[PDB]
């Protein structure tokens, strides 16, 4: 018992040191106010009205001419700021290099006009795919904006947008350091008709740097031009910390990174020495599976932070020439992947803390309750999600062309979780379909929220009463 | 046991093939992005401001003169697009033929002015009914806009609107291919006063075609003119796929339609051979009743898809002359009916999957729980809906003239489901009636959400504890 | 048993006839679309912008000069409509007579300036009470707008507003039939400064009549001028049916009124013959108490419908002279009281239906469950409302000066019911107080929604398990 | 038993007198309509558009030039009102003295530009701290607006803002009694560039007095200028009652204050005489701990109301000279502290009422239920908050740079309480991260709302069934 308590004590203090080091590392991932660095950029570029007589945003673009009014107007008035040269956005954020506008095109004849309509309609342009993509030169043909450049040649990568996944290739134009040259270039693209019926996407990419808080911010504005016509705007404001060793707390964060990877080396050694004793008996446990998940996610985090996130070859390459476009699209991608991995790792490391709070009879009753009802809650989770996805496919077939919240199948699932909580927009459901809007909503509230929601609760009630009346009979019958 | 498992296995693989074929069919009913084809049309016609100095939408029309500003303004600037002839909306969507504006009128003297007020008020115009409807010529009397045309003669059908159900007859005017002729026609209707005090509805109907994604879109804009005065706008943007065999996946969808109707022939043969053995004993089951519901809904789906939805006689009739109005009002109606039928059929086919997940002792406990509490949940559902409709009739008598959410009795029911979830607009309830708004809301939250909502939960708790303690005593007493 | 079933059968068919007659009566109280008669009047007078260069509504008035812009602007453009004389609003609704603007004033010196500030501040005007009210003539003193008229002399009655209850007396001005005379009168009130620092309320009253649907609509617009400065607007659009016998369905409604008061005579005779047998034993029942409540509310409904609602002496008095103000302020008051009484009566008549659904063993189990848990749910309702009003008084002391939803104590109670459901505006709570906003919200969610909400549920679970295990032991032990 | 009931009776009537006196005291803390005194000031200064061609508020300031448009525009049009001298805001609220604008600055060179960027970027200005704060004179150097004044010399105190805690020192400028002198001063600050890149905060402070209701109102407008660039506006409208003895009800409130502090003297004597008998046995009770909490909070309330809130030395000092700035920043601070203390004291005094409702067998069952489940609910509250803060740290790492509701860690906690209720903005979560937005939301709804929320409920169900079946066996076995 003293050796069991000694081993529990040393693994507890090991885990507590590990949890302290990890919570220090994610204290330095989040600087104190980066939200007020992304929302000023967002409200400068997305929320300002496009022209002085227009009320459209970037968020509410609806046409191609609104996109030209944005590119000639709010984009140029946001990027270029007159000095008290080169532009400091909000007189703080240095615009790095030049921005870049890039277009993706589909071919004429990339779809098939039906045989009874080949007299009336001459041309058709398919939805964006890589097979449908246009490689031909067009327009005046005398620049990089008019000639196709491959994905390998403009150092790009695939972007996952709202209606398609867009290749990193296309028809790009790097802009200029000053507003007047850039306005001349945008007017020369609009005059020669650069965006037409074959256009399926337009990317606007630039990067700023804040010397005060030492953060880059990689901006990507995407406008998707569907085959149906119109405009779907999308944006991405992504901060990067690419220059690490500036302040003392950054050196302490580097020290905690080293101490963290020593902890992860220790846990990988420990779980390998535990799994070698017994093979499939190791996975007949929840905590060994959770330790496997933690060390896999942590090795993936160390791998991203070595081979991807800390490869600032493009930054030193940009610091040679300030008149080019800085390719920060890969650093931002792997910073997003690293933040997702690290957040999920911190989550499961806090879930691991439940090995060490069976310190009491009450906590042991709670733990025994949920471990004994896990199987029956999983069975009813299967049954619940069968009825839940039946309703989601019903709602997708009924409202999928009319309602924003039901437009894709996963959005139907997430909308139903919101309906179960109470986040409804029933006005648009009830005006999309006036008979099955009502019937869908009322039968989903009755059969899910009144009845099947209470069945998880019934499983937990019965298991808690069983565990209490069993561990009380065990406590009494030993005392008799 | 081996033959029972063999029959269960063959009906399981039959059902799984059927579910795969049906989920393929409703993968091809929903194209990937039709929502972005209806919302661009909606934001072009509903959400654009009516005039350049006006802020009213079509959604926020409040008067007859706002309707004339819409018909002279946002409607003409949305329909007619200058080519790089005939108009391509968003340079993608071909306007098919001409649009059509149609009016429904009631008679002077169609109601009775009370005897003490026949001196002051000369004329009264009743709420729209078919008996009150005006058949007389009026105005200049020299067109189709000024002379009544029956429902049989303009090929129309009854429309179910917000305050009435409107006959397909009336005073119609087909518009023109170009903007200037159509503006002349609308100005000639406004000059001669076409809409006056007898007007009860105005329909605007047109159809576009997108060659890129191969979808028609049947637009119907309704403005209802109540007897109280004012305007109630209503719209309907409905996509159709009327040209089937264009792509290869469409041929695969046709093959899956044939394989589906062979499955439905198989299930109708099976359920007839099962019902012939025993009459009313067949309906003493849930799964035989569900199989009856599935084959009835599926036969109705096949009947709509043969005798109604796949009758594109008006499309080939329209392709002869591009200067007429294409009657797509029936195809859109039966496409809505087919989508409702098919969505409900897919829902119950997924519910049928619960015959085949009694594969475990836990799943059998869950199934036995809900099948044994079904009767007592139905009894308390009767009692709950009696108190629920008592509150709904209370709230209709109190707020039915003041609040949008309580304006009709079914909307009172749906508003109370939203209050139970937590979708409240209590500001308008509390300013409609400051005493019974409060009392209604607080007693509805106390008696429904705190007390009667927990009674379903009590039934499910007690039935689950009973089923577990019974199937555990059955498992133990057989082992003793 | 046959005589018991015979008496139950005759009282059941008596109650069913009574419920049919009552549901017919409240089918004719609610005409089919009165909501679209109040919202057109509301959107004409409340929601139109006050001036063509102004964006304020009547709903968003914030100053006295905005009130003059409304009275010179949106009010006159809403009331007076040029004919194709006298004004038909939306060319349907006849403006009856002239409108009337009325002011309530407080005295100079109606409060006490503190002794250290009687040098700087000369005058102070107390919050509106009847003791503080000004009776003096003022201004040019040569009209009814400048001379006090008592409540008995302008036939008015007390109005219960947002911050005070306002007497029906004051300084009134009846306006005119045409727009130009009324604009001259409003400009003459603004020139001579009619609203100043003593003003505490301004009422605007008018009535319209719709000949098409046979409804009056009594409009009262109130602007309250607090002692703090500013404007609190308030409105009331109230439809009346003052001319009864016009259509055939109205005669059938009168016949159902007579049959209803015969039913209420029958039930009063029955409950008096039942209460005379046994005194306080009669009130030891729920259904006898509910019958007492129904016949009291029904006698109050008949009394309002005879002595108040059907006294259309002011209507025939108005029909003599169309150039005066029609006093419909009492008819609207008693129509609101009659609608409240009748809605509550219909509610309890539907609750009475539970005497007659103990037709089954399951329904008897549900009824026995709730009748046996009524006492313990009432005890925990006492305990719950003690903690609930403790939180409401906490939230009133903390947010009562900052948040709209916590401004009065009853609004704190209703806001907490909304928080329990999930209708939160946490942004304004969290910016009103950044420490106790959080602590109030999180401890109210934890202690009410997680814990004390589940205690009602515990009472109902235990009582249902007790009633089922008791009525099953009664069913088994009789069979053994 | 008679002496036990006698002691319970005398402590009950003592507590009831105490509760009446305390509820009278917090009836006079809240005047009837102070909310309509703060919202008129708020809608005058925050919600009016900044210029006649601008639509920005004070609430929606986004730049430094919008702040100059506010200070030259809406602030001057709100403060200065032309008389029928000195300004009465809404012709009721006397502007006391002059306002004051004050700036906080950071030094050039207060951060470290990284070594590879010291060529491009010359200067950097750190986030506001006291060590980074600028003390140097700047600009024209010939006023108080251009020369640093310490916190001890301008009588200020530290302000806790949104992104920092701001010292009470800085660069202040007292404004003027009239609009033209103040406009000259603000134009002279804008001309000489008073706000530049070193500015981190700008305070605008003024005080009004309403003679009608006898309330001061201390306004503090804060604009925070982050290092990222932009503007974060913040406000504080705080009413004070600094002149006590004006009306008779104020004398009754003073009498109730004296009677309250006599009650608190009585309870401190009683709890000291009870704690002296037994030391740590005293704290083995809930009601003795609650009495300790009440008398500690009440002594803190009396201490604030004597040594801080009732020290109106600055008011009589201001009444000598009406041309200076009245320092009401300390009185408002301690009035906020006193309102927090008094509201929490009233809350726990109402919670103390549960000593005296064990008057019944049912109330004793409810009390015994919650006192016996307190320990197991505390254990599961520990386990629940471990999983809850694991999710909050996940959501802070994922959405903390993108979403308003997740910007700080405590706001992540409060957002998750809102998600559990049903106050979601899922659109911004789902567009911040399209993979972990969904996964976070759905796994938080499944694991918290479906499963772990029902575990508190299971504890309460089992404890209530145990207490009922135990106190029924105690009632029966004594009767056998
Ligand atoms: C017992 C089995 C149940 C009985 C059978 C069910 C009832 C069958 C007939 C119901 C009519 O079917 C109903 O038709 C109306 C139009 O008339 C359709 O409505 C559709 O068009 C109307 C207007 O035309 C729109 O207002 C509505 O938003 C749209 O959904 C509705 O979607 C469909 O659901
Ligand atoms: C014990 C049985 C309960 C005691 C009897 C109940 C109290 C009877 C008297 C209550 C007064 O009845 C109450 O009158 C006010 C106006 O004064 C009505 O209010 C009505 O007009 C006022 C203004 O005039 C509006 O503010 C309010 O929105 C409207 O509902 C309210 O709807 C009605 O509910
Ligand atoms: C909870 C629901 C309650 C709804 C029912 C309320 C009670 C309504 C019935 C009360 C008696 O209803 C009463 O009907 C008589 C009919 O002779 C009406 O009388 C009116 O018309 C009759 C005949 O047309 C005239 O002789 C009489 O002078 C006139 O006042 C009276 O205006 C109405 O007051
Ligand atoms: C007196 O009444 C007349 C109307 O007869 C009005 O025009 C005039 O303004 C009033 N006198 C003053 C001083 O306002
Ligand atoms: Ca909710």
Numbering used by the authors:
A (entry chain C), B (entry chain B), C (entry chain A), D (entry chain D): 213 to 296, 305 to 700
Authors' account:
To investigate possible binding of anionic phospholipids to PC2, we determined two cryo-EM structures of PC2: in the presence of PI(4,5)P2 to 3 Å resolution, and of PI(3,5)P2 to 3.4 Å. The overall conformation of the protein is the same as our original structure, i.e., a closed state at both the selectivity filter and the lower gate, although we did in this case observe a disulfide bond in the TLC1 region of the TOP domain (between residues Cys331 and Cys344). The two structures reported here also differ from our previous structure in that they both display a spherical density below the selectivity filter consistent with a bound ion. The identity of the bound cation is unclear as both calcium and sodium ions were present in the buffer used to prepare the EM grids. In particular, we examined the region of the maps where phospholipid was found in the simulations to see whether there was any evidence for density possibly corresponding to tightly bound lipids at these sites. This revealed clear non-protein densities located between S3, S4, and S5 in both the PI(4,5)P2 and PI(3,5)P2 maps, suggestive of lipid and/or detergent occupancy. In the higher-resolution PI(4,5)P2 structure, although there is density at the same site, it differs in shape and could be interpreted as two UDM detergent molecules. Overall, although the overall map quality is high and reveals the larger amino acid side chains, for the most part the resolution in the non-protein portion is not sufficient to unequivocally assign a given lipid molecule species to this site in the final cryo-EM models, and so no lipid was placed at this site in the final PDB file. A 3.0-Å structure reveals a binding site for cholesterol on PC2. Further examination of the cryo-EM density also revealed a possible site for (co-purified) cholesterol located between the S3 and S4 helices of the VSLD and pore domain S6 helix of the adjacent subunit. The cholesterol must have remained bound to PC2 throughout the extraction and purification process, since neither cholesterol, nor the cholesterol mimetic, cholesteryl hemi-succinate (CHS), was used in the PC2 purifications.
Polycystin-2 (PC2) is a transient receptor potential (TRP) channel present in ciliary membranes of the kidney. PC2 shares a transmembrane fold with other TRP channels, in addition to an extracellular domain found in TRPP and TRPML channels. Mutations in PC2 are responsible for approximately 15% of autosomal dominant polycystic kidney disease (ADPKD), which is one of the most prevalent genetic disorders in humans, affecting 4 to 6 million people worldwide. Here we use a combination of MD simulations and cryo-EM to identify and characterize PIP2 and cholesterol interactions with PC2.
